[PDB]
Amino acid sequence: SRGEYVVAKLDDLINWARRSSLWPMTFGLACCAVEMMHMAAPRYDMDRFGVVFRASPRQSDVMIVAGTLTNKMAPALRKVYDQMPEPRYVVSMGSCANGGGYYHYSYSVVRGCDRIVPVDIYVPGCPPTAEALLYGILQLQKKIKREKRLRIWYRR
Amino acid sequence: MFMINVLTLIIPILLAVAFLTLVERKVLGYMQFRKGPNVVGPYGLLQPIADAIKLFIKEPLRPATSSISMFILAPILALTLALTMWIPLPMPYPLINMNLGVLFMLAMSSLAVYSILWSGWASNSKYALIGALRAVAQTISYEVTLAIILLSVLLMNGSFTLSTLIITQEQVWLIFPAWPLAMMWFISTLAETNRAPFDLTEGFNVEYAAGPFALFFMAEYANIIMMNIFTTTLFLGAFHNPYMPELYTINFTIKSLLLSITFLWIRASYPRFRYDQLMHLLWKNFLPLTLALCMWHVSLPILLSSIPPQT
Amino acid sequence: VAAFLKNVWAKEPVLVASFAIAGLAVILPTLSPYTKYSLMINRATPYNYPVPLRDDGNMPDVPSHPQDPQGPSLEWLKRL
Amino acid sequence: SNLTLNFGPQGVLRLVMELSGEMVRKCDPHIGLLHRGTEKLIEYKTYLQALPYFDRLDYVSMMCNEQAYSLAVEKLLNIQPPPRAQWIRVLFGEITRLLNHIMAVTTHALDIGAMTPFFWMFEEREKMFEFYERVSGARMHAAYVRPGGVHQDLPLGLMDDIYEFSKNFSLRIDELEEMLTNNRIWRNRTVDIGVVTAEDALNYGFSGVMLRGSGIQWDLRKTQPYDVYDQVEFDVPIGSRGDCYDRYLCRVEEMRQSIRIISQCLNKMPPGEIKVDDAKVSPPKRAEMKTSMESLIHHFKLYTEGYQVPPGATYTAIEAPKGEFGVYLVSDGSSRPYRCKIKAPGFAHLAGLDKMSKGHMLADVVAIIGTQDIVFGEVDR
Amino acid sequence: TYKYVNLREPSMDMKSVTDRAAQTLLWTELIRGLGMTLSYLFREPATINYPFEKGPLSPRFRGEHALRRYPSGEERCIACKLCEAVCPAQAITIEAEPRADGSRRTTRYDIDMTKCIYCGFCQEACPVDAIVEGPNFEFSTETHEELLYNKEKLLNNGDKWEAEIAANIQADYLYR
Amino acid sequence: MWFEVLPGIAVMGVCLFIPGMATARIHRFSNGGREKRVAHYSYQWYLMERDRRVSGVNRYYVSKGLENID
Amino acid sequence: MNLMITLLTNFTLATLLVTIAFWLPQLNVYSEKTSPDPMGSARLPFSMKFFLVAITFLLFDLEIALLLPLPWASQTTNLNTMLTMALLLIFLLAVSLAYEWTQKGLEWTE
Amino acid sequence: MELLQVLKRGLQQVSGHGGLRGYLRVLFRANDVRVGTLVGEDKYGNKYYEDNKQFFGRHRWVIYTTEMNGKNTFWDVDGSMVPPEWHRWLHCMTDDP
């Protein structure tokens, strides 16, 4: 049908504009922040992908949780996640954000940031390299590319 | 016909503001030993379009506002004053050719602080109001030296006419007799637009959604490009053949782009002033030299018999 | 006058440049030879109409035509 | 009344400010936001297993904390590393010092507003992380410096690349110093800011640049020297006013002197083994693990049980780039520590943050949190 | 053995005082900083074209885990449990039994990659070079349980990556 | 390298070139092939209204020379 | 008339842009958010200093309002009187600044 | 003048990708148009290029195929598309293709 074609091209357009202009809010919790800063450094250079460096949380597209999530800061993580406008995404980076990591059996560590916020991309490593974090961000962009909001809206 | 002239003024203003963001990200790329955007478009040319469509379909931030009226009128005033600063600018010919275009631009630039003040009070955050009051105090501080430097240069112009300011500089750039005025004017226009190293708001409109925040952003870059064009006309004014206006148009365009790149090249070089440090810079460094040079530029066309013509 | 000036030029050179430029602006028009020609140019600029006179009979120093010799001349404005 | 702000966690730090307008009357840093209970997890793991926790304390000074823990365990074991392992430890400790001072200076400039030398110096930091990845396989947390020496010998051609890096790195220091040192805006943000007297710096437990910026002539590589720091020749920069600008200059000069030490370590690297040749502490080679019976037994028992450390308590302190980094290790005779207190300089520095930010303003608080190089991993453990 | 940073006294002749006042009024060091930033504008940037260009790595690199086989198809792992004994994160879980030909082999070999700290003690504790931490770092997942590898995933990693793992071990085993 | 910024500066320069080129060509179109009459002062407006009166076609820019006198 | 049409067009364009920016993202149906700052709940304390720099701006802007007809005043035939009064007004602006200096008036906004 | 050689090198980069069509192909798929010595090609269509005049990091690269394992990778290029025999060469783990 015609309207299916129109909403397919409109999904392609809005998915292009949302994946080619991702603005990250980076939680600099622990050692993974250093490798995020290397992913922003001139070698790997997030900014050429449209991924800007240190946007504010109230206009960011993706929350990168980069480091250990302790019990003392889990409500602050959820609060900053709730202040993010939609569509918001969460990238988990490194082992402590993913599943607790080297502090999995700790009394004071949230065992994975997916007990707190919904996580889209799990980037593994300790720390994952800046090239590996950039691979995870490009896989996030591909996940945004195959979204079907207006196609499902026309079919609902 | 005149409406076509108004639209061909105000639509390429918005296009040049859209691509100033790309030029800024590219220049601050290559000055920071990296690349700017080059993936989204061919050489990154689709980055402003992708950015604008991202900001315009984002969820609204849904603020609780102290006012509806000022919360809506602050972007409207910001964009209206950002577009109406372009109408007396000779490029070589202005849209609205008036006798007092310099004083017109000084007045309409003094009116731009109400956007900051209304958007700061129309947010419920007290920190946003403190940042907005500090930005308003900064802007009204540097408007003083804007007015006095502008007056001293127009003592060499002869009138408040902006088209006479091209006739004034036919034999020499006006940066040569007025380079201390030119450098204090340049830093003062840098401190008008909350531009680095004077950007304390990045170190007042955090309650707006992504759309209206983009509107404030594009009004701010319209102000940046406009004050660079005004500085170009006022100190580095180009040759004007009346039979071929494209010579002056190409020339002031190249100089204005180099001056906007100089803004981008200054923000990639310096740390931020602390607030009382740039208050010290205005009220205790720029203002005494500005007053002394105002006395000099009053008494100098009289002592040289170089009083400029009234008409 | 020599140690104070060096002290203020080392501590606050902005204020020294301020008072020096302001002092030159105050005193230097009273010493320039070109200052008289500012007044002589401003009185020579004809914003109004030079309304003619009725010739009563005894006025040798007033011309009857613009291209006549007698009257005010601006040869000095050309030459300077 | 007076103002009370909460600069919250939106590392990470919570700050409770009592302000009197523009001034700062009281600064309360609420920490613990990266408390992970490291030094309780150390108690259930062996000495080799507790080694990679030290990489993640000061996560911009990895091989330094590895070196301090390795020196603590080797002191309790009454064994010493071979000389080549000692020169490799001092070499990579000074490369780690360059890493930490680039992180310190460029983030201290980034927070104030100079965002450009960050990008200029993280390419050099990227090359030093390539040196870490070539020597150990990981770019940050190497687990390379071990009790007994190091884990593995330098790959061939690594020292030529450390030469090619060190030959060019002084120009990078010079262009950083061109952007910031004589810059009047950088001086106006750092000269009158956080003046620390020498007596209060000794009293508050400050260490490193936080002492040496205030004129105290104390460096643990000179006074209480470890592996081969009595055999290298370098100078110790000393401040004069105890402010943020002198501490900036001390860190730039420590980059200079680290380049000097790295040149001397490249020219004086001896031949030999890289582990202690006691196979009851350091594991044997894999070629002799797969041929000798004693070496297979020692491989089995070191990678399952580990070496037993004799009972005793030690406080081993080294000169990490943030200051005196100490390990108070208590061994009960088993192959696991009984106790491991981790002294880190940033804890006492962030304790002294409240005195250093009295009478200053709110935008001077970020300069004082910059001049104390605070990594909250080492603060909160 | 020590040096005084910032203990210079400025000169007080008219030359150097006028030099410092010219530096104040004419913004000379600010022009020096602009000159350094302008110098980096006209350099080639350090930016590689990822995904089409890759950052340089070494054969010691510790990426994704894999289980190797002998050059007869027999898997190298003989269930000795040294790698889960030395694993500082306790990310490895092993269960074993004799299989149908009497060989000492594992039935469970799990590595929780979200617990793993990627330090490679398992590959250096392994007496038969069975578990290796190979070259792969681009294995990000969209789901948490996809980073919980069982024995089948690790053997498929070994079969996928053996052509590169064997060459890295060949290039590096003389340092080990 | 550094010349990659130049497509963006080229597009921005064309966008800054369009308003002045537009207003120059529109002033030469709407005024009979010439510049727009600048009347900042009432004498200039008076001569402009005299032009509009002497042209007969209610256009200030229709010039009348020596062909209109005898 | 051309200037009023230009002001009306710019105000209309700005109103249309703010209208699009407040109507277009509202047509997304995303989700209603439940439970929608450095200071907790306190009153903003009045600062003396920001008011002082505001009044200092106002007074020096009045002095600028006196100084603005100088590019027209330099055309006069009483140039000695004009130069005297011009130097007198800029000197009174400078004396206002010097009195604002020396009596601790420009403090913590220096 | 050495601007002329810069322009000639740009024009022969246009000439080296098989004309304007291949030039725009590599421009929109790669965001980089420089030519290199074809080192090799795997069993999928990934092509592998060297240029030892570039700096260390740029001197080896890959142009990913348009179709691998049933996925149209004309725009969806992916880092994991490199087979492991090329992964030591491309990540500079060895000098040998």
Ligand SMILES: CCCCCCCCCCCCCCCCCC(=O)OC[C@H](COP(=O)([O-])OCC[N+](C)(C)C)OC(=O)CCCCCCCCCCCCCCCCC
């Ligand atoms: C329009 C085209 C471009 C124009 C030029 C602008 C481009 C160059 C920009 C460079 C980067 C600037 C970034 C922002 C910098 C802001 C900081 C700064 O510079 O602060 C200003 C600094 C502030 O001083 P300071 O903070 O550096 O020094 C310490 C100051 N005290 C002592 C008060 C603590 O200097 C000035 O205020 C000087 C302003 C210009 C002076 C011009 C004087 C001309 C010479 C007159 C004669 C002097 C001789 C004596 C009398 C002789 C009489 C015959």
Ligand SMILES: CCCCCCCCCCCCCCCCCC(=O)OC[C@H](COP(=O)(O)OCCN)OC(=O)CCCCCCCCCCCCCCCCC
């Ligand atoms: C009735 C039929 C018509 C229905 C209405 C539609 C009208 C036309 C609307 C514009 C075009 C819609 C189609 C959008 C693109 C769809 C295909 C797509 O997404 O292609 C992806 C491709 C980039 O591929 P990528 O995956 O990024 O590869 C990275 C390489 N390393 O992307 C590219 O190569 C470039 C993509 C560019 C997208 C188009 C340009 C942006 C939109 C411009 C118009 C709207 C905005 C106007 C200005 C806004 C304010 C400034």
Ligand SMILES: CCCCCCCCCCCCCCCCCC(=O)OC[C@H](COP(=O)(O)OCCN)OC(=O)CCCCCCCCCCCCCCCCC
């Ligand atoms: C004063 C002048 C101001 C100028 C402002 C704008 C400057 C930049 C202009 C754009 C420059 C060129 C951009 C080219 C983009 C890439 C086009 C393309 O090929 O997109 C591919 C995409 C998917 O195509 P597909 O069918 O998948 O093909 C795969 C084949 N195997 O297919 C698509 O995406 C569909 C096609 C989309 C085309 C969009 C082109 C850009 C539109 C930008 C908006 C503004 C245009 C200019 C307006 C003012 C000037 C008139």
Ligand SMILES: CCCCCCCCCCCCCCCCCC(=O)OC[C@H](COP(=O)(O)OCCN)OC(=O)CCCCCCCCCCCCCCCCC
């Ligand atoms: C909060 C509400 C919404 C806020 C957003 C909208 C308002 C703010 C932004 C727009 C500001 C409009 C300013 C209007 C007047 C500008 C000054 C002006 O007209 O100066 C130019 C000129 C004087 O020069 P001259 O050469 O002598 O005149 C030609 C004679 N040869 O004079 C002329 O040429 C005279 C031309 C005719 C008179 C023009 C009057 C315009 C209408 C009155 C003002 C409308 C706006 C009112 C609100 C202002 C802000 C609160």
Ligand SMILES: CCCCCCCCCCCCCCCCCC(=O)OC[C@H](COP(=O)(O)OCCN)OC(=O)CCCCCCCCCCCCCCCCC
């Ligand atoms: C007659 C000529 C025209 C004069 C009137 C027009 C002036 C134009 C410029 C306007 C300036 C407005 C502001 C003036 C304020 C002056 C007072 C002042 O600033 O005194 C304070 C200052 C010491 O600063 P402090 O208060 O300690 O601040 C702490 C910062 N670390 O104190 C000082 O640093 C000492 C400042 C006073 C002495 C300056 C001497 C300069 C001499 C230059 C050469 C001669 C010039 C001719 C004039 C005669 C001077 C005696």
Ligand code: SF4
């Ligand atoms: S996964 Fe590891 S290296 Fe990464 S932030 Fe956590 S502790 Fe640090």
Ligand code: SF4
């Ligand atoms: S790399 Fe380290 S943490 Fe990971 S499985 Fe091996 S021994 Fe355990």
Ligand code: SF4
């Ligand atoms: S992988 Fe190696 S160390 Fe682990 S149980 Fe198997 S044979 Fe033993």
